[PDB]
């Protein structure tokens, strides 16, 4: 059955993405004297982790590794409704397991927040929702543009183009809203550590931006 | 109409480029205790933002996202005068809108200069004009060479080649003149914050270098 292989790839791709990506966010200076945060380290690991799982699993499951990307594909009629229910379930379970493994191997002195995304204290939930909506709009627009079969001018690696789109979103909004861009990436650590503050903006925000980018490309720019 | 889709893509591409690129320049240590400037973070975000909007909109509008690039295209007879009047207006509006959104979501404590380009105090306006002319000459030469249809030896991603050309210009001249390389990138924040010092070199500099690169390639090297 080709269906169960695609669902298993979504679980496995999301597990590795969350473990390696969240591991790079660990502060190794401890709670006593925290080390300066290296924004380039976090941005590249998140971006290059997506570029790798798209390369690995792109031909097996489609390489979504994002509940917001999966929702956009349903709206534009690229996957079935039943098919997309299992990707969302698999993506969430993979993130939960990936963060669970990170918590076990990390010494208790440096676990900290375990990479849970939080909105800036001086930034309202209204502004945090808007930031998540824009960095996710440009991520899903790149996916549709790169993977458009009518184009004849797409050159280079499609997986690496998508990876650099994730990185620039992180280089911008790590200090604003955590630069989630992914509902399942935020769901994982929250379940483990039990941090549920302003968690509704990481579902409405990314999903709203994903639907606009998919609908705007498929129905307005390149119909 | 295919024209209004190209003008709309130039407005939207320039909006996202300005918001994400200028956001990476925010100093989150505040005006009290500024944090050290990370030059690689700023260079990569500017470079990877251009590589992404070329990938997204390259087949829709031509992927100029630069008033200096559009002027070079007109001189070499690649777009009409009427077509290029609307791209420059759309690019300028997108820069204004993109910088305005950044100012709304950014706390007043860290807004600072909002990414406005400024010439070094000890560097004369004559030197600043020359610096802008050289980093823009090599950027427009890359665009013409990568997009040359007579070539048969171009390999890899054309969008990614252009992005790394924007990065090296930033790795050099951030501390000299701010590394504009783009008249509309400097026009945006200046309108919002009202900082208009030495603003004529960010139009004369980039435009002269772009025309030299376009004319030299199209009429001397590869006619």
């Amino acid at each position, epitope marked *: 059955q080709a269906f169960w292989k695609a669902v298993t790839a979504e679980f496995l791709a999301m597990l590795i993405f969350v473990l390696l990506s969240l591991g790079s966010t660990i502060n190794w200076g401890g709670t006593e004297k925290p080390l300066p945060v290296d924004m380039v380290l976090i941005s590249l690991c998140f971006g290059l982790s997506i570029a790798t799982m798209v390369q690995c699993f792109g031909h097996i499951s489609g390489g979504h590794i994002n509940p917001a990307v999966t929702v956009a594909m349903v709206c534009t009629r690229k996957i079935s409704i039943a098919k997309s229910v299992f990707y969302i379930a698999a993506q969430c379970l993979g993130a939960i397991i990936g963060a669970g493994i990170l918590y076990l191997v990390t010494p208790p002195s440096v676990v900290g927040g375990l990479g849970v995304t939080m909105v800036h204290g*001086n930034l309202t*939930a209204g502004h945090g929702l808007l930031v998540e909506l824009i960095i996710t709009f440009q991520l899903v627009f790149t996916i549709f543009a790169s993977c458009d079969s009518k184009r004849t001018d797409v050159t280079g690696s499609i997986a690496l183009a998508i990876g650099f789109s994730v990185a620039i979103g992180h280089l911008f909004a790590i200090n604003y809203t955590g630069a989630s861009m992914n509902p399942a990436r935020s769901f994982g650590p929250a379940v483990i550590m039990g941090n549920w503050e302003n968690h509704w903006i990481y579902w409405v925000g990314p999903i709203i931006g994903a639907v606009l980018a998919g609908g705007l490309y498929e129905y307005v720019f390149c119909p | 109409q295919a024209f209004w889709k190209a003008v709309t893509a130039e407005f939207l591409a320039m909006l996202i480029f300005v918001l994400l690129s200028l956001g990476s320049t925010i100093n989150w240590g*505040g005006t009290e205790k500024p944090l050290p400037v990370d030059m690689v973070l700023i260079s990569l975000c500017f470079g990877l933002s251009i590589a992404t909007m070329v990938q997204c909109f390259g087949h829709i509008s031509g992927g100029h996202i630069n008033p200096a690039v559009t002027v070079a295209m007109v001189c070499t007879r690649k777009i009409s005068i009427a077509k290029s009047v609307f791209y420059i207006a759309a690019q300028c509006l997108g820069a204004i809108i993109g910088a305005g959104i950044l100012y709304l979501v950014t706390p007043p*404590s860290v807004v600072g200069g909002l990414g406005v380009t400024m010439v070094h105090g000890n560097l004369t306006a004559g030197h600043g004009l020359l610096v802008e002319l050289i980093i823009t000459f090599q950027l427009v030469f890359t665009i013409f060479a990568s997009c040359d249809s007579k070539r048969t030896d171009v390999t890899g991603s054309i969008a990614l080649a252009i992005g790394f050309s924007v990065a090296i210009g930033h790795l050099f001249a951030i501390n000299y003149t701010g590394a504009s390389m783009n008249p509309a990138r400097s026009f945006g924040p200046a309108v919002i914050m009202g900082n208009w010092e030495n603003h004529w070199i960010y139009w004369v500099g980039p435009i002269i270098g772009a025309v030299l690169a376009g004319g030299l390639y199209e009429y001397v090297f590869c006619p």
Partner: antibody
Amino acid sequence: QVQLQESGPGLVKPSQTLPLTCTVSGGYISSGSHQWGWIRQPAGKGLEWIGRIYTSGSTNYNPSLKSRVTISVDTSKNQFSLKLSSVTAADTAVYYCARVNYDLLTGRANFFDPWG
Amino acid sequence: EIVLTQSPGTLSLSPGERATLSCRASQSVSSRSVAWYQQKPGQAPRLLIYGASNRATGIPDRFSGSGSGTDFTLTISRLEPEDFVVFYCQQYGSSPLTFGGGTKVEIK
């Protein structure tokens, strides 16, 4: 220098709300790197935090008081207000409005100088 | 939440002696994030130390604090007639903010 002055009824029967207002002089709420919050001190006890607010309108409340506390900002008149609901005899105290320091990177509330 | 305990409950000395106050934290406090306040009975509190080692503007040099981890101390070189008032210790290394219990100083 910056100065703060409270204002309120001073005698509330049980089960109503407690409106208090703090007026700032010598400094501007909008133009600055400070938040503004409230503290109280029940008779014969220690200081207890209540909440804060920023010029952007974002607030943080004490977890034990998050349900009843409500704080708003009026930058036009340079004031911020408090609204405590379902007051009870245990809420008797001396209420202060201070200027909360904070850290730029995360936006969390630091020490509380000056006081009202 | 980090629970702060201040001992002794009351501290007695003659004028001129050295007074030392202890604020022990139930959990590690990040980046030495502790501050001290002094309240005159019937008056608004006052800020003395922030960061456990930095002194506020205009505070007499006889006030100094130090410490780290889960133990911080406030020490007064020489007492004064007006220094026999309550003292509070605050921690802001992890939300929510919490205060101490208070350490009254009385003339022996």
